[model samples]
Target: PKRIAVVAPTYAGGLKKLGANIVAVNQQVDQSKVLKDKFKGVTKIGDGDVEKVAKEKPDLIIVYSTDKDIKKYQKVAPTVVVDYNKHKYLEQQEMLGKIVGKEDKVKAWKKDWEETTAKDGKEIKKAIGQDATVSLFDEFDKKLYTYGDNWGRGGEVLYQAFGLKMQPEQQKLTAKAGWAEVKQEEIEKYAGDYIVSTSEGKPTPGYESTNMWKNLKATKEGHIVKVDAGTYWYNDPYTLDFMRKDLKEKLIKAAK
Candidate 1:
């Protein structure tokens, strides 16, 4: 079989399910032996060095969004940029299927996605109800970018695709909108019945350590829940749609 090398600053964990004959090129671990069983044979190349990775000359290279050398390697091999700007896991699965020539698998993945979201949304409405306003943010740089269906894990699948919304204000902004870097008291400008945050990944330059965290109503009320940032909930369309149903179930449990 032709080699499908997964070059990343970190491992693209989902590709294993699609059976990618891989070379896990990350600097932190021993590339050759760490995931020997999981992948046909794992190879962590170049201590994650870019030029070293180019040495392999693989058939295909799956790049994670967080990785830096996408442009360099895009020419080196067939590359699919997974989870770059979006947050839905189903998005990842769909793309991953294409990267590995698994269109039929994508069909089944959709079924799984729909089943999960349906179950999750149903559970969410049951427990939290439409009235339970939700807001998700964190203190950063000095601005707050409210999430809509296009933002991250929460927005892409749940709000837009699943028809479950965050709050009315989020609808106005879409996912990529920027903020004015206002004070905490002005936080009501981005309020919700319940709130979620996105501070776990990359840091925003405008939000260079502000003191506006404690004042949020959602934070004060303890409704500002921490998300999983994992396979089903975060990104990857193949996983999140179905993960939503399970996630919705958890929300229900928490609701009670």
Candidate 2:
């Protein structure tokens, strides 16, 4: 069995899908106990705690390109720095799977998911309307950051692959880079038919208490869903199942 050390929870999901014997997890995760068990008695470390992770004697290591101190990890094991932005979800999965010598598994994963994505995308379009507006928001920096296809919690599937329309302000931002910061007073301007909040299950502090939040059409209609960032935050083959099930259920439920 190949022992792998993952620098972040997001990276761990794909490694697990590739059937790596993940020996350790560095950085944070939503539920440490669950993920630790999933990694089968994995060691959890702090951000860029390469020294602690090195103690695991991993056969291979993977870290996000954004991770700090890449050199330290290279000293311990042959390291691969992954950039999620470099490839679309399934493509990245295939690439990473090949890296770990699991090409067949990755190919199968992609085939199944492509079928799922196509099937689900069409069904969602029919059920919710192909042009139905969807938006993603994260409660960071005391402001609601509206997301686009690439950066949103599940918008890569929702808006990009599924061809769902972006909320007005969010649509304008589709041509640019990064999320747009929206004030509480301006919530209505970009409110979509369905909204996914990427607060990792917690309602945005202070903002959720406001009348603006209480009265948004999507909120009033129960079309707002909160998803764990650890799942949707990482765009990979692994997240395809998580996002598909969650988005399908919520979109259908909200339709009622």
Candidate 3:
């Protein structure tokens, strides 16, 4: 249907790219601050409330499976609850592609995914040692957030697609929520041979003026790559497309 409502900004990005007329979205970014400039022409529904979304008269409502109001959304309109078992980002596209009659687009996007992954995957492997481990950390909410595969917060590009390994201790979080909070003082324990961030070169909450963060081996060695939050933080096909080029440039250069 043309009029669609999505509970998450990532889903909005996915549907918007598929040419859906997104009537409303709860927020423009999933975990980070919402940027209206990034979501031109789409209505921002503010607090991710289903009741607010229902007022938009959307033909459909799509929500993460963890949403508390699954039945509430179903009552408003046909709802699709998404769960991130493993590759939830693409899985959402696969399911939504069928629902939105955009299977052809999804196929084309999938082809791009395979092509980019194969091409860039080799480049990253060659640049960084084959045994190199990559680690992701973000400064948000005055705490350090380390990533896994869920929620697309840089882990999708680092761990899921690139096939790079995280520190052995961090590997256990692969199928869990994308990120977890860690103390600022002990953040170095999570840093691997290489480090990456979801920040667009801005000092994050826990990172600003922190001597400990500056003295980390990765920082001192210039092995950390900071990425644009708009693309790195979302798993939508459009963002994923952006990620391929961004990561290839940033990571390949940093690996050297």
Candidate 4:
């Protein structure tokens, strides 16, 4: 389908990379500073706004499994309900490629990505040690949270692509759900050799001032890598490309 309407924000980046003509995207994707330029001239659709999406006259419409208006969207076009969490970023890209009839591009991109990550993984292991563990943390509504390997916040780059280990407790906690909230006092249990602190641009309010945060082995050793939350929220190919390079530089610096 040439005119694709994507209600799933995460799918927008990969679809665009697949050379799909994105006729519309969810508002969040349209508003993303990192992705906005890639989707210029695309229509922005509101959540559950079948009317707005209908105006775009897309040949295909992609929506999240959680969307309640799938039937409504189907009335507009051939809508596909995708469970975003069901697959890893690479698999998701391949699936999107198949959906948009761009499997050749996906195959070529995966080949290149595998070659690049294989080299990068070795370099990162050398810098940070083969068994070094990494953790991802972010603040939501003033509460701290940790994530599993597939969740964003560079989780894929760290635990998946780079093959970094995770603190055992964090691994166990986030394994099924992909993320877990951490109480301030118990944050130590989840701290790894390297910490990826994801936020807009600063530490969570009052988090940095706490002795617990200041005294963590990773934090004290300058092994805390910071990433912009806005930019690190999606695990698409385009976003993953940026994340791969951004994390390599930061993790190398942190390892020093």
lDDT of 4 by residue, 1-256 (tens): 4789999898999988888888899878644556877777788878878998999998999988888899798999998876576337788888888887888889899889878987898899899998898888888788889988867777777777777788899999999878899987888989989888876466455665589989999889989888877788887887888889988888887785
Per-residue alpha-carbon lDDT of candidate 3 for residues 6-112, written as tens digits (9 for 90 to 100): 77555766677777788887665534333344465666776447678888898888777787787777888888775544456777787777767898888888877
Q: Cα RMSD (Å) per model? A: 6.2, 2.7, 3.4, 1.9
Give the C-alpha miss distance for residue 252 in model 3, angstroms.
1.7
Tens digits of per-residue lDDT, candidate 2, 1-256, equal 7888877566676778777888787646445323444555567777768788888998878887776777788899988877666226666677678777888888887777767777877887787777778878777656667777766467777765666678877778654765677786777788888887866456465666679888988889888877776666656455666687778777866763
Task: Output the worst ten-in-a-row residue range by lDDT, candidate 3.
Answer: 29-38
- In the predicted model 2, the residue pairs found to clash are none
After TM-score superposition, the amount by which residue 172's alpha carbon in candidate 4 deviates from its true location, in angstroms, is 2.2
Q: 1 or 4, which is superior by lDDT?
A: 4
TM-score of each: 0.65, 0.85, 0.80, 0.92
Return the top candidate by lDDT.
4
Compared with the true structure, the alpha-carbon lDDT of candidate 1 equals 0.54
The stretch of ten residues in a row with the least summed lDDT in candidate 4 is 200-209
Worst 10 residues of 2 by lDDT: 29-38
For each candidate, the alpha-carbon lDDT, in order, equals 0.54, 0.72, 0.71, 0.83
- Displacement of residue 172 (Cα, Å) in model 1 is 1.3
What is the TM-score (0 to 1) of candidate 4? 0.92
